Amino acid sequence: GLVPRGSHMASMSDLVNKKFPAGDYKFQYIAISQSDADSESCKMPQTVEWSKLISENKKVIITGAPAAFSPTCTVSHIPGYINYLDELVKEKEVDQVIVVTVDNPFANQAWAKSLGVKDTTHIKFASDPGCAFTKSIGFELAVGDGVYWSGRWAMVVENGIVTYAAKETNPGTDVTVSSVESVLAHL
Amino acid sequence: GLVPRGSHMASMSDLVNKKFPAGDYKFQYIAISQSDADSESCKMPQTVEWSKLISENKKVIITGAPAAFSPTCTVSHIPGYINYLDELVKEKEVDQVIVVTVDNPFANQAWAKSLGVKDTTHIKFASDPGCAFTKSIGFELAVGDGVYWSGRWAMVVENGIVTYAAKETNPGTDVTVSSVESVLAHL
Secondary structure: OOOOOOOOOOOEOOOOOOEOOOOOOEEEEOOOOOOOOOOHHHOOOEEEEHHHHHHHOOEEEEEEOOOOOOHHHHHHHHHHHHHHHHHHHHHOOOOEEEEEEOOOHHHHHHHHHHOOOOOOOOEEEEEOHHHHHHHHOOOEEEEEOOEEEEOOEEEEEEOOEEEEEEEOOOOOOOOOOOOHHHHHOOO | OOOOOOOOOOOEOOOOOOEOOOOOOEEEEOOOOOOOOOOHHHOOOEEEEHHHHHHHOOEEEEEEOOOOOOHHHHHHHHHHHHHHHHHHHHHOOOOEEEEEEOOOHHHHHHHHHHOOOOOOOOEEEEEOHHHHHHHHOOOEEEEEOOEEEEOOEEEEEEOOEEEEEEEOOOOOOOOOOOOHHHHHOOO
16 A cells, blocks of 8 residues: 555645744744854844744745754754755745754754854744744654654745645654755745 | 842752652763764663662762753853862762753753763763753742743762752852852862
8 A cells, every 4th residue: 555564654734825823932042143253142042923033024934853963953954954045045035944943042053053054144043942832833742751842844934824834754763844855845 | 138139048958968859750861982982872862760870879969050052051060060070080989970951862962072071971961851850859940931941050969868959049140059169068
């Protein structure tokens, strides 16, 4: 048959073609800049309302990852987004790329820096504390004892409407529907 | 008076002179080694029962920090423990130094490496998922919306008995009772 022993297929989420469900959810991030890198804005987290991010930006890519500094996230998933960032912004008219984890915003910023992010103008590493937003869209990953990390997923939002949304069935090892290549194919 | 406007004093916890309350709590960490650094044990987290750590080690120092990679934790708090590690182990008969955060174990390991930890034989950066253990001893830090980080604190456990335990009143900025210097004064 199509799906053999214990295999699973990553499907498109029902979120597609609906309004981005920002609610009152907020994320934190710390800016990064190659000019004035010692400013307070590049040291301390700031809070962003998901609703404001979406209303102020016509085209937004969002991708979730289970754990800052973990192998699959660090080596196979996120570097592609950083590599294609200039092309996304300059050729595909992407305004913001948001990388979402439940990790603290200092760890997220250090991760971004380790991955070669020099400037957060068009890319931000967002903290979703307690997995609140990610659980709200059903893209969470249970890791035991009531603790949730983000799953691995990607989303495209255009003019406030979700045009692409899909999560991995095996987030620990797979980078497929969440890959920058699959996102590029849906822009 | 002794305590003026909005000031607070860090006191000794009532935990002192009582058995270490390990319960069934567990932590995760990833080992670090300068020989065989590419082994699976240095890539993937392993689980340790707090009860086993304490029963197998006569003298254990435990210190909690709110956020891997955050400024106070990274610059002022943890480096002292790493700096004194050899002295603690060789002169003060310390068997294990455990640095506790609620951060994922990959981020904790990367933090430890960034801080110059070369080997986890006597020092381990532990993950306390969801702040479960730290909340159980009342050393947590509320950060909003039901999310808890560790506070900043230190503890000494000798033959299964807590001999020192104290948390900061202002963990974001203060490193006093949680400092390696205060721990050294209570060994």
